[PDB]
Write an enzyme that holds these catalytic residues in place. Structure first.
Site, short mmCIF file in Angstrom:
data_model
loop_
_atom_site.label_atom_id
_atom_site.label_comp_id
_atom_site.label_asym_id
_atom_site.label_seq_id
_atom_site.Cartn_x
_atom_site.Cartn_y
_atom_site.Cartn_z
N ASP A 19 0.86 -1.20 0.00
CA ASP A 19 0.00 0.00 0.00
C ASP A 19 0.92 1.27 0.00
O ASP A 19 1.44 1.69 0.99
CB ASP A 19 -0.87 -0.04 1.27
CG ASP A 19 -1.76 1.09 1.38
OD1 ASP A 19 -1.70 2.03 0.54
OD2 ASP A 19 -2.51 1.11 2.37
N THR A 20 1.02 1.82 -1.20
CA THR A 20 1.83 3.03 -1.38
C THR A 20 1.16 4.23 -0.73
O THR A 20 1.83 5.25 -0.43
CB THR A 20 2.09 3.40 -2.84
OG1 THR A 20 0.78 3.56 -3.47
CG2 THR A 20 2.80 2.31 -3.52
N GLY A 21 -0.11 4.20 -0.37
CA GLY A 21 -0.79 5.30 0.35
C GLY A 21 -0.59 5.30 1.84
O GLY A 21 -1.06 6.21 2.50
C1 LIG Z 1 -10.97 4.42 -1.53
S1 LIG Z 1 -10.62 4.79 0.18
C2 LIG Z 1 -11.10 3.23 0.94
C3 LIG Z 1 -9.86 2.29 0.88
N1 LIG Z 1 -10.42 0.96 1.12
C4 LIG Z 1 -10.29 -0.04 0.20
O1 LIG Z 1 -9.90 0.18 -0.93
C5 LIG Z 1 -10.75 -1.49 0.48
O2 LIG Z 1 -11.27 -1.50 1.80
C6 LIG Z 1 -11.58 -2.78 2.30
C7 LIG Z 1 -11.25 -3.94 1.57
C8 LIG Z 1 -11.52 -5.19 2.17
C9 LIG Z 1 -12.12 -5.26 3.41
C10 LIG Z 1 -12.48 -4.14 4.15
C11 LIG Z 1 -13.13 -4.14 5.42
N2 LIG Z 1 -13.43 -2.96 6.04
C12 LIG Z 1 -13.12 -1.74 5.60
C13 LIG Z 1 -12.49 -1.69 4.34
C14 LIG Z 1 -12.17 -2.80 3.60
C15 LIG Z 1 -8.87 2.71 1.92
O3 LIG Z 1 -9.07 3.39 2.92
N3 LIG Z 1 -7.64 2.20 1.56
C16 LIG Z 1 -6.48 2.53 2.47
C17 LIG Z 1 -5.89 1.18 2.94
C18 LIG Z 1 -6.86 0.29 3.61
C19 LIG Z 1 -7.37 -0.75 2.90
C20 LIG Z 1 -8.30 -1.63 3.48
C21 LIG Z 1 -8.61 -1.41 4.79
C22 LIG Z 1 -8.14 -0.38 5.54
C23 LIG Z 1 -7.23 0.55 4.95
C24 LIG Z 1 -5.44 3.36 1.73
O4 LIG Z 1 -4.71 2.56 0.85
C25 LIG Z 1 -4.57 4.04 2.69
O5 LIG Z 1 -3.54 3.55 3.07
N4 LIG Z 1 -4.96 5.24 3.28
C26 LIG Z 1 -6.16 5.99 2.77
S2 LIG Z 1 -6.48 7.19 4.08
C27 LIG Z 1 -4.77 7.09 4.69
C28 LIG Z 1 -4.15 5.80 4.36
C29 LIG Z 1 -4.29 4.88 5.49
O6 LIG Z 1 -5.30 4.31 5.82
N5 LIG Z 1 -3.18 4.89 6.34
C30 LIG Z 1 -3.05 4.03 7.56
C31 LIG Z 1 -3.30 2.58 7.18
C32 LIG Z 1 -4.05 4.46 8.61
C33 LIG Z 1 -1.55 4.32 8.02
#
Ligand SMILES: CSC[C@H](NC(=O)COc1cccc2cnccc12)C(=O)N[C@@H](Cc1ccccc1)[C@H](O)C(=O)N1CSC[C@H]1C(=O)NC(C)(C)C
Lengths: 99, 99
Positions: B25-27
């Protein structure tokens, strides 16, 4: 380009004629941008992340330029902490992860 | 490998003797793993993303094997729904984003 990850992978996007910054996010299925006015009708979506689920507005077939590359696709608008370019649009620009 | 983004970039990791699936996860600034026991001293931290903030335990100097590559770094443990490999460890395996 080849983007290393020692710093956040921030790029400039152009949407609605405005320049904004956004993160290239391989962990995001979808693209989510901060509150702004976009053209057309929207549909409701719930997306979830680390801290729970949020309601967002779905707009389709929106033109967006990402680091100079033109993409046309779905954009979600809502209360996101950072503008996120997710895999729906990273595939359109041909991005891959390499190691 | 070269990993395309048509699907979630899930890989096998080995941590604390256990095999788990995690998202590249590059984000993500940080690496966040579901609740498990690890040896050592930890400090409490709050991390935020879509949906808000959660509380995690910060472990320092942990060894993790990511798709067969060893890296060392800080790992956060807590109630995440998905195991996330963030930029702090992606750097160490030489991952880049290319388009
Ligand atoms: C389009 S924004 C929504 C995105 N979610 C997803 O693509 C997929 O989510 C899910 C997939 C599978 C099961 C899940 C169950 N419950 C919630 C979400 C789920 C998301 O928040 N992705 C984030 C990673 C992630 C994926 C799945 C679960 C939870 C987190 C993102 O890549 C990231 O790193 N972000 C976006 S906001 C900041 C940063 C992030 O969260 N940073 C941390 C992890 C808090 C340091």
């Amino acid at each position: 380009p080849q983007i290393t990850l020692w710093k956040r992978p921030l790029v400039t996007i152009k949407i609605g004629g405005q320049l904004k910054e956004a993160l290239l996010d391989t962990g995001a299925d979808d693209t989510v941008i901060e509150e702004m006015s976009l053209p057309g009708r929207w549909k409701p979506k719930m997306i979830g992340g680390i801290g729970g689920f949020i309601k967002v507005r779905q707009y389709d077939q929106i033109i967006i330029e990402i680091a100079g590359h033109k993409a046309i696709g779905t954009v979600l608008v809502g209360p996101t902490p950072v503008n996120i370019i997710g895999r729906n649009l990273l595939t359109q620009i041909g991005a891959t992860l390499n190691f």
